[PDB]
């Protein structure tokens, strides 16, 4: 014990366009910077949840005694600009 | 000095032989048991069987009696462990141990450095990197640029920024396993709104298994 | 001395997705095979003329006593998706 | 035997001096009238102005009278031309001439080589290839692959296909000259539709004032 906690960092890039020219898309949400390894990823699409094709795994970063977390999300790009951009949600402990 | 050095890390398919070594020096190779554990990834440890130099007197475990065999070479002082017909579920870290001067004939205090060992379905691939553009459009906070690599078969990847430049504010995270067997992962760095594109903001992907050169921009 | 006439080419490529997904857009249309080098270049859009932006030489290839001709129209990639897609008309001697 | 040679290829910027050199050997470099010939490209012969090697008797031209100025030294028999406050409109070929043992005094029988000067102060902007996708979605006829060349300053850029192979099919389009003053080209190659990508269909432009070696397929 003894480590403070840390709340955990909310980076997500919209879709690249390199990965956007063929028939593909992947939604990258970047998680770190939090000490307990318990988190999971939730995708929603304009507040409907979407589960299709997603992963999610808490490696760590390194002796800085935190973890990190990734998740993607790979879909059609026809489903990209059928709505509006995709919000990441952490749960670590609260809505964020 | 005694030491044990094993070969490197060896990545097959299922249905294909495989024989890794473990070479121990700085001892007599003659007396002390050599064994192999297994140890799989968020497992605990599993020994397999064990060997000795002088004579074979191989003594295996009740579930790896006739799954896996062991053998050795006196005149060399080489361990071997060979595998044959290998699964899905053969993919774990293999360790080499050997008794020490003091304790029980299997009590396995001296380690070896650890063989990565990996088998798959699915067959080598080049990654395509991809350049994550920042938030051009919401340039509040602080930018951050960087690469997407995907669609790879072998684990380590080595991404740099401007041929190693740019030490501070690059963190690497490490890949997921997606359902396919391809690995995923990603490289940003935190920079200034204000700096975008300094001298270059190229990324630099290498690929060892597949001879792969990508530098791009972004 | 010259050459008798011949027909010139109608090759259009749509816009390539690399410079479609990002901010820029271009249609490239290929005119060549052609003695008479005078040759003007229309974009339409649905019917509609368009000339915002739009550049075309008349240069020769290589010694088979012909020339080239070659036309770029730049425009925003939402432009592109906002209407069908666009239409070159060469005018060498009819509509073609 | 009476040879005219002149200096290398000078690039240089505008609002900086030049001095070309244009030496003659193998006459009595004193009696023959030398001069300067501008030469656009595209365009016509343009005088400038001559010299006496003997002594300092210069006419320019009364489009060139204070533009340019003309100098020799006899001691070496070598001919100059200086130049001040260089301009975008300077960049033409410029030959060196002199008077034959037959003929008028401004005749200029004789010629040199030719010194290639360009300046062309703008900004060299790096080749963006986009490779143009063939019609995918109607593959009725032949069909076409090729990349867009773009966002290019200097006009001479070489594109083959797969390091020079497929020779046939392959036509290169000259650039045209935007308005932003960045060129653009396009080369393509007729393959049949049911070959789509044979080997690789790869894409090979080179740039040399830039030194980019961008490869993409498509």
């Known amino acids: 014990l003894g480590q403070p906690k840390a709340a955990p960092s909310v980076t997500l890039f919209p879709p690249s366009s390199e990965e956007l020219q063929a028939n593909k898309a992947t939604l990258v949400c970047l998680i770190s910077d939090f000490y307990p390894g318990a988190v999971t990823v939730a995708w929603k699409a304009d507040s409907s949840p979407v589960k299709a094709g997603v992963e999610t795994t808490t490696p760590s970063k390194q002796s800085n005694n935190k973890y990190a977390a990734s998740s993607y999300l790979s879909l059609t790009p026809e489903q990209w600009k059928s709505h509006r951009s995709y919000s990441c949600q952490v749960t670590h402990e609260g809505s964020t | 000095q005694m030491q044990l050095v094993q070969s490197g890390a060896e990545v097959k398919k299922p249905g294909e032989s495989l024989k890794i070594s473990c070479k121990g020096s700085?001892?007599?190779?003659?007396?002390?048991?050599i064994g192999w554990v297994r140890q799989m990834p968020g497992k605990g440890l599993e020994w397999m069987g064990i060997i000795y130099p002088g004579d074979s007197d191989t003594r295996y475990s009740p579930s790896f009696q006739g799954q896996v065999t062991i053998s050795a070479d006196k005149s060399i002082s080489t361990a071997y462990l060979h595998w044959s017909s290998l699964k899905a579920s053969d993919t774990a870290m293999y360790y080499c141990?050997?008794?020490?001067?003091?304790?029980?004939?299997?009590?396995?205090?001296?380690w070896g450095q650890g063989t990565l060992v990996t088998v798959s379905s699915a067959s080598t691939k080049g990654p395509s990197v991809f350049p994550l553009a920042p938030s051009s459009k919401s340039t509040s906070g602080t930018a951050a640029l960087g690469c997407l690599v995907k669609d790879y078969f072998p684990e380590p990847v080595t991404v740099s920024w401007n041929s190693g430049a740019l030490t501070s504010g690059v963190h690497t995270f490490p890949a997921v396993l997606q359902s396919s067997g391809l690995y995923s992962l990603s490289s940003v760095v935190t920079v200034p709104s204000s700096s975008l594109g300094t001298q270059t903001y190229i990324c630099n992907v290498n690929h060892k298994p597949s001879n792969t050169k990508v530098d791009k921009k972004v | 001395l010259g050459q008798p006439k011949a027909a010139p080419s109608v090759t259009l490529f749509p816009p390539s997705s690399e410079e479609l997904q990002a901010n820029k857009a271009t249609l490239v249309c290929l005119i060549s095979d052609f003695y008479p080098g005078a040759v003007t270049v229309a974009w339409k859009a649905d019917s509609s003329p368009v000339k915002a932006g739009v550049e075309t030489t008349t240069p020769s290839k290589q010694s088979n006593n012909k020339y080239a001709a070659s036309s770029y129209l730049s425009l925003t990639p939402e432009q592109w998706k906002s209407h069908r897609s666009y239409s070159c008309q060469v005018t060498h001697e009819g509509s073609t | 035997q009476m040879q005219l040679v002149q200096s290398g290829a000078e690039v240089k910027k505008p609002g900086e001096s030049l001095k070309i050199s244009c030496?003659?050997?193998?006459?009595?470099?004193?009696?023959?009238?030398?001069?300067?010939v501008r030469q656009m490209p595209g365009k016509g012969l343009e005088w400038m102005g001559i010299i006496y090697p003997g002594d300092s008797d210069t006419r320019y031209s009364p489009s060139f009278q204070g533009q340019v100025t003309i100098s020799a030294d006899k001691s070496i028999s070598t001919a100059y031309l200086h130049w001040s406050s260089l301009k975008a409109s300077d960049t033409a070929m410029?030959?060196?001439?002199?008077?034959?043992?037959?003929?008028?005094?401004?005749?200029?029988?004789?010629?040199?080589?030719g010194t290639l000067v360009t300046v062309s102060s703008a900004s060299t902007k790096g080749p963006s290839v986009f490779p143009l996708a063939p019609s995918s979605k109607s593959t009725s006829g032949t069909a076409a692959l090729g990349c867009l060349v773009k966002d290019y300053f200097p006009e001479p850029v070489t594109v083959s296909w797969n390091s020079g192979a497929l020779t046939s099919g392959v036509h290169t389009f000259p650039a045209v000259l935007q308005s932003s003053g960045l060129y653009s080209l396009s080369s393509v190659v007729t393959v049949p539709s049911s070959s789509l990508g044979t080997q690789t269909y790869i894409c090979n432009v080179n740039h040399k004032p830039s030194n980019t070696k961008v490869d993409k397929k498509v």
């Open positions: 700085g001892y007599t190779f003659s007396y002390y048991w």
């Open positions: 141990a050997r008794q020490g001067d003091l304790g029980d004939w299997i009590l396995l205090g001296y």
